[PDB]
A paper describes a structure:
We used 12-mer peptides, P6-P6’ (with the scissile bond between P1 and P1'), in our co-crystal structures. Six of the nine complexes were solved with the dimer in the asymmetric unit (in P21 or P212121), with both active sites in the homodimer occupied with the substrate, while the other three had a monomer in the asymmetric unit (in C21). In these cocrystal structures, both active sites were fully occupied with the noncleaved substrate in essentially the same conformation. We observed that the substrate peptide was extended along the [name] active site with the scissile bond (P1 glutamine to P1’ residue) positioned between the catalytic dyad in all cocrystal structures. The N-terminal (or non-prime) side of the substrate had an antiparallel beta-strand conformation which was conserved in all structures, with the substrate residues and side chains well resolved. The binding mode of the C-terminal residues (prime side) was more varied, especially beyond P3’ position, and lacked full electron density. In addition to the fully conserved P1 glutamine, which is stabilized through multiple molecular interactions, the large hydrophobic residue at P2 was extended deep into the S2 binding pocket in all structures. The sidechain of the conserved P1 glutamine was also extensively coordinated in another hydrogen bonding network. The volume from P4 to P2’ is highly conserved between all of the substrate complexes, despite the variation in amino acid sequences; this high conservation reflects the specificity and likely evolutionarily-constrained regions of the enzyme.
Author numbering:
A (entry chain C): 256 to 266
B (entry chain A), C (entry chain B): 1 to 305
D (entry chain D): 118 to 127
Write the structure that this text describes.
């Protein structure tokens, strides 16, 4: 699809 | 005997992985001495990642905005600076598990080991290669940013890669440990596309040379070919054209086996035109293209790494 | 404006050049910290260059057999060891003129500044490119081995080459600062021959991008070509086949000009198939192949050191 | 001609 930065949302 | 894609033991690298959290965004960091290296887009929110101004976003943050968790202990950030596309977080404590390390830039075709990490903890290790399109065909999920690629040369741990993003085709892009991206990619979620995915030809020839050393030589022939004729055939099968330097790279393997590079090129040319036809090489039907000639010598020697 | 083969300022490297004498053999040495790096064949006799036993020759030598002269001062050697083809001589004084440095290994096509030295004193500085056959077309005489090739990035002096020998065809060969030779050459006076010298295609296109930036764009056409079709014409004129990674190296030049890489390739095809027709580019009648895309960016940005 | 290690005499 589109390029995404592979960090994550904080939990 | 035998040859197989091998990664370095990741024990020394696991001791350098930490978790870096800025607001609601978290990723992995590399803790060497009193500096923590993490991808600069950790300061981005979910909405900032479309077209961020990293100089603008970095001024918004202070030292206490960076939560660095080394295992089960929070590290105190006493300084921060941006080098290209990576963040340098200075902490008050030097990592006691810091091994002998160096920051190098690998080249397309070369191989290195990747330690996939999430939340500062290691989850897997695999050996990959810098593809001709300056990407890597790895396995990365959300939160894998900050994972490092590395090689082990004697005593030194050569950090050469650090993960950032994934491209639309499923391949991955990153930078060196100085923040310079590999290829024409930028750490933002705008429209980007990788180059044509081709096969590293020089590594396939090294794989064929390793098969001859191992004892597999049913693919050889009495014929030789020119560099131009092989490249005209290799280009039709999406193989990278062989350069003169890539021929000299296979020199030691050509001298050890007594088979010239252009001699082995006629074998690969026949394997592409006629096909494998239901036969395997080194116990596999596919031609491995992430096995450099230096990897052939490493597994011939049995040297510890 | 203007584009030309330009070397880095040699002032920082001049303060690290020393003369290494072992018996009747003089060489140049690189003095960094308390270690003097020099080619290991300085321990070779005049009649012991055919097949010297380097391991046996170094054992028979002691610290008193090495005369290290830094201008008018004689540095006392307190230790000696061998790292591949490079000799490491530990001295009792650390060079204060040692700049921030690192040891890198360049690739074919890339450029670097060569500081020609004789008797430990700098003679000349010029820009060289690592040819596809892993040689350089320098100007080296007897006693020039030990001269170093280097690049300057920001405040760091990146050493990448050390001169060793001259090949029969007049080209020159050497190692990196770790002792590993560039190409399938050995520091022995036995039968050795370099590969076929070809034109570095990615540098010619970078030179065409420089002319375009300089306002020289008479060669630009409206036609486009595929990567495979361009390589078929290129290798017919002894040009290196353009790999996919080399297309990405021209990225910053393609973005700065807005001309696609394959568009510049089609302009090179017409220039090769039809010739220059009594015309010049950047004041040159022939195309230059020792100008990397980094050299184009470096000269149009004017970064000081 | 043979390759020559380019080290000066004396």
């Amino acid at each position: 699809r589109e390029p995404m930065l592979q960090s994550a949302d904080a939990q | 005997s035998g040859f197989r894609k091998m990664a370095f033991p990741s024990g020394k690298v696991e001791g350098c992985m930490v978790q870096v959290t800025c607001g609601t965004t978290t990723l992995n960091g590399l803790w060497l001495d009193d500096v923590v290296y993490c991808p600069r887009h950790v300061i981005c929110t979910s909405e900032d990642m479309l077209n961020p101004n990293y100089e603008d976003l970095l001024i918004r943050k202070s030292n206490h905005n960076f939560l660095v968790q080394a295992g089960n202990v929070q590290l105190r950030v006493i300084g921060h600076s941006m080098q290209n596309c990576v963040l340098k977080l200075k902490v008050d404590t030097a990592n006691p598990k810091t091994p002998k390390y160096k920051f190098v830039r690998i080249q397309p075709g070369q191989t290195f080991s990747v330690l996939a990490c999430y939340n500062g903890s290691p989850s897997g290790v695999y050996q990959c290669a810098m593809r001709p399109n300056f990407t890597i065909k790895g396995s990365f999920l959300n939160g894998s940013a900050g994972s490092v690629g590395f090689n082990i040369d004697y005593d030194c741990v050569s950090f050469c890669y650090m993960h950032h993003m994934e491209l639309p085709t499923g391949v991955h892009a990153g930078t060196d440990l100085e923040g310079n991206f590999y290829g024409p990619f930028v750490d933002r979620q705008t429209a980007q596309a990788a180059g044509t995915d081709t096969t590293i030809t020089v590594n396939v020839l090294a794989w064929l040379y390793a098969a001859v050393i191992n004892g597999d030589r049913w693919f050889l022939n009495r014929f030789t070919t020119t560099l131009n004729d092989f490249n005209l055939v290799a280009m039709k099968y999406n193989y990278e054209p062989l350069t003169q330097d890539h021929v000299d790279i296979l020199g030691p393997l050509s001298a050890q086996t007594g088979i010239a590079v252009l001699d082995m090129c006629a074998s690969l040319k026949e394997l592409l035109q006629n096909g494998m036809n239901g036969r395997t090489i080194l116990g596999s039907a596919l031609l491995e293209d992430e096995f450099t000639p230096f990897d052939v010598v490493r597994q011939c020697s049995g040297v510890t790494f």
